[PDB]
Amino acid sequence: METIAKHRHARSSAQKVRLVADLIRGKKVSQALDILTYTNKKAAVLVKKVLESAIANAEHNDGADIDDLKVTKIFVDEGPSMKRIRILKRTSHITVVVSDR
Amino acid sequence: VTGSSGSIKSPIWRSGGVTFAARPQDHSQKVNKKMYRGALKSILSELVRQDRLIVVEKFSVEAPKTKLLAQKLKDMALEDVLIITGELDENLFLAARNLHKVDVRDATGIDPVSLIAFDKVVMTADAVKQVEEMLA
Amino acid sequence: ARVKRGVIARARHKKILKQAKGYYGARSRVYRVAFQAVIKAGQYAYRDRRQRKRQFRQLWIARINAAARQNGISYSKFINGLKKASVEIDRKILADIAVFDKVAFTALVEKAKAALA
Amino acid sequence: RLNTLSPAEGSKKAGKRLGRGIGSGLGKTGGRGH
Amino acid sequence: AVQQNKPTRSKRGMRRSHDALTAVTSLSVDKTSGEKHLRHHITADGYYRGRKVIAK
Amino acid sequence: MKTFTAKPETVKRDWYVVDATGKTLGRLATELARRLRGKHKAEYTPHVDTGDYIIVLNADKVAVTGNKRTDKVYYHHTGHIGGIKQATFEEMIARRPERVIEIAVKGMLPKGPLGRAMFRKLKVYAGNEHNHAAQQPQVLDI
RNA sequence: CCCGGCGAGGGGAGUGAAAAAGAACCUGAAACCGUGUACGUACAAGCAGUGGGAGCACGCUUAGGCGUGUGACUGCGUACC
RNA sequence: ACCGGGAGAUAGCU
RNA sequence: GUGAAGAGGGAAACAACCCAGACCGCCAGCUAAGGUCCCAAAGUCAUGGUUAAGUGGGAAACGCGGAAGAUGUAACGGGGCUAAACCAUGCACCGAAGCUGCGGCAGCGACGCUUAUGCGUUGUUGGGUAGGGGAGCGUUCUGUAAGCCUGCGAAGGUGUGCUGUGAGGCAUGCUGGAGGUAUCAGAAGUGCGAAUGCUGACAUAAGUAACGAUAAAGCGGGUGAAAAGCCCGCUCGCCGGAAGACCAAG
RNA sequence: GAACUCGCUGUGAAGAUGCAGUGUACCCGCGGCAAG
C-alpha cells in the first residue's frame, strides 16, 4: 500500500535540508531512523519527523507487516518566502513516499 | 492623472495616462440627400427584384390583440416581416410591440438598416403611393 | 477597444521555443538568447544544405580514387578512360557500386584502361 | 445576402502602419530615416 | 573582482558534488540492554559495554 | 537512397609489416599516414577509420637525403619557465628512433581524437623481431 | 481516528459533483528549483550549433530498415543591437 | 531650505 | 571597381588582393581564380635544364657577398620535401551559391485562342541599407446574431498530426465546468527585443567573509519534548568621578 | 548576452582563451602566491 507524507512551511533552507534527505532515498527505514537520530544537521529533526509520520500512517492505514516497508521516493522543494528589511527567509517543503514494493 | 528622472505618472510607468488617450468624439458624418435617395431606390429595386416584397391593400387588425396579429402572420406563411404602412394604426402598433421580429413604423420612418436587416417587408397601397410621392 | 496581447505573445514564444529543443540549457529556455540561437541554427542549416553536395562529392571522389588505386590506376586516368569510352556514369553510382560489388568495378576499370589509349 | 454588402474594390485602404515590425517594409524610425 | 558573466548550473553542480556527507553506518548494539548505539559512547538508556552508569 | 557508411565495429583491419632499411623518411611517412587513414581501401570513410594495423621495423635505418643530416632538428616545448630544451635529431635517433618515427607520423597524421585513435594503431620497433606474430602479419612493401 | 509537542503540519473515514475545490481555498504557463524515466560523458580544447552519423530503449507496416529520446565521432562555423 | 502650480515650461543631443 | 547596401570561393586567417552577382530545392555533370605528398580533393604526371644552397620557404641599395629580426624553426601553414623548389611547353583531374540537368514557385513584358477575361507558348527577372510602391495574417469591440457550436464539453494552458511563399490556420489526448462564435464589413488604447524603458516574481556570486568591542566565563539544579546564551544557586573575572543611581525630553 | 572560460606563433580600429597553424592536458574540490 503506497503511503505519502509531507510537511508545509518548514523553518529551514530549501537546499540545506536536501543534504540530509539524500541519505533516505533508497535506504530502508530500519537503519534510516537510526541514522537520522544520530545526524548532526538541524534538518535531521524534520527528516525524522516526516519519516515517523509516514511510518505511523503506513502502520495505521495498512494491516500489518510494517518492517518490510521500503523507502522509494523522497524530495524537497522551495516554499513561500518572507521579505524583511533586504533579507528573504526561505521555507522548505519535504515529501517522503514509502511503499512496501 | 492624479499625482505629483521622470514623473511616475508618465505613460511608460504604471497607473499612468496613455500616450494618445481617446477623447469624447463623434464618429457620425454627413450624408447628402442625393446619395441617400439613390441608395434607397437601389435597395428597394433589389428587394423587389428578389421577390421579397408583398403588398396588401388592407392589413388592419380589428382589436389590439397580439393573438390576432400572430394568427394573421401565420396565415400569410411569413415569419420575418417588417410591416411598414403609410399611416400608423394604434391597435396594430400596440399588438406588434411584444413580437420583436414584427416591427411597425410610420411613413417617414424609413431607414436603410430596417430595409437591409429585415428579410421581408410588407406595405400597403397607401404606403407605396406615399413613398412614391416622397423622395422616391 | 483595448486588446490584450498576452495570448499572441505566449503563442509566439511557444512556437519559437518549440524549435529550441536541446540547446545546452539557457538557449533552449531563455527567449532572449533562444531567438538568436535558432536564427544562427537556421543560418548554419542554410549553409550546410548547400555544403552537403560538396561533402558528398568529396566522399565519392575519395572512394573512387581508393578503388582505382586498388585496381592499379590513378583517379584521373580512370576518369579519362571512362570519358573516352562514351560513358556518363555519375561518381555517386560508381562509389555506391564499388563497395557492394567488385566484379562490376573491375570490368569498368578494365574498359577505362582499354579506352584510355 | 445581408453580409454580401462590401466596399467597392479600391475604395478603402488600411494604410501602412509605421513602426510595426521589420517585414512590413519600413522598419524602425517610422520610415523617415535618421 | 567582478563577475564578467553568470556561471551556469552545471558548474555549481560540479562544485557542490563534494558537499554530500556520509552516514555513520556503525551502529553498535548494547551487550545486555540490546539497543543500537554509537560506538564508544553512552547509550540513551545509560549503558556502555553492558556496565551500568548513573544514567540520570 | 542513402550512401553506405562504414561501420566502426565491423570494419576488418589486418596487420602489414613494413621495413624501410634505407628509404626516404618523407615517402615512408606519407605512405604510412595514407595507409593508416584507410584512403587506399575502397570503403574509405572520414567518419570512422578503416585502416590496417602497421608495424615498423628498423626505425634507425631510415634514410635522409641532403643537408638534413645536420640541419634538421626536433624541438618539443619543455614547459615551466625557459623550456627551450631542444633535441637534435641525431641524438634522438641514436637514443630511441621510435620517438622520431612516431612524432613524424603524428605530424603527418591529422591531429585530433580520431588522429590519436589512428596513432594508437601504429607501433614502431627498432629490432627486426616482432612480438605481434600471433596475428599472422602479412608482408607488404612500400 | 492516528502520527504529532495538549502546537504547526500531515494521512485515513465521511460530507462534498469535484477536497487534481480545505480557509495560502476558480482555471494555474514561463523565468527558479526538485525526484523518477530513455541516452551520452571522466584522453577530451574555442559563440556549444549545423548536415553526415554507428550505437544505445520503445511502439509501429507484428521484421521489410517508419518515428520518437540522446548523440561517440566527423567537414564547416570569431553572439544581438 | 521644503511643498502645489505656470509646466507635458524651451534648444541641442543620446 | 568594392564596401556603404553581395553573399560564394582562393591566398594560413585579413575591410581594401584575385576569381566571382545568392528565386527555392535536388546524394547529377562541366568550368572561373586557385590547386593535384598528406592534413585537406585531385598527376608523388610527361619532356630539357637550373637549383646540393633547406636558397626555395625574408629582406634592399651597392660591389657570390650584401643576410642581422621577430625570444620557438616561428617569415614554407605543420609535418615533411633533393624534387614534394624554379624556369618553358603539353594533357588530365579537383575546384564557388559560376554554368548546365531536373523539379516547384512570385513578377516582367511579347505573342496569339482574344475573351467570359482566363488560357497556351514565350525569353527574361527574383542579393540588397535608406527610401518608395503593391499584396496579406493575427486580437479585442459593434451589425450581420432570438442564426450556429457548446455540461455528449468553449475559452486559457499543455502535446501530437495535417496544411500554406507567409504573418499563420484546422482535427485531436490531458485538469477545466460556462461561454464562444461562421461569413462579410466598420471601428482600434492593436503585433516588443535592447531606450542605464517601468510594476511584480525569480537565479549568479554562496553556503561565501561576517555574525558588529578583544571585560572572560564555568559548574549543579529547575521549567520545557527539545536548554551555556530560558530560570535559581554556587566558583572566578570586568567596570566600579563607571559599564554605578536619579531627573528634563521622547 | 550566453559558455564545453588552456599556452605559443602569425593576422587583428595595433598585447586574442573564442580568428589560422601548432603543443599540452583524467573529471571535480581545498589553502595560499596577485601576472591579467
Residue numbers in the entry:
A (entry chain S): 1 to 85, 95 to 110
B (entry chain E): 52 to 55, 70 to 201
C (entry chain Q): 1 to 117
D (entry chain L): 2 to 35
E (entry chain 0): 1 to 56
F (entry chain J): 1 to 142
From the paper:
The E. coli 50S large ribosomal subunit is composed of 33 proteins (L-proteins), one 23S and one 5S rRNA. Here, we present a biochemical and cryo-EM based analysis of the earliest period of 50S assembly, utilizing an in vitro reconstitution system with purified rRNA and L-protein components.
While state d1 can mature to d12 and d126, an alternative route involves state d136. Both states d126 and d136 can convert into state C (d1236), a process we refer to as core formation, that enhances base pairing between the 5‘ and 3‘ ends of 23S rRNA. Domains I and VI exhibit full cryo-EM density within their domain boundaries as soon as they become detectable as parts of discrete states (d1, d126, and d136). As we do not observe a state consisting only of domains I and VI, their contact areas may be too small to drive stable incorporation of domain VI in the absence of either domain II or III. This suggests that domain I together with domain VI cradle the missing domain in d126, or d136, to promote the appearance of domain III or II, respectively, to conclude core formation and early assembly. The presence of domain II apparently facilitates docking of the CP-forming 5S RNP and as a consequence, route 1-2-6 involves the possibility of CP formation either on d12, or d126 resulting in d12-CP, or d126-CP, respectively.
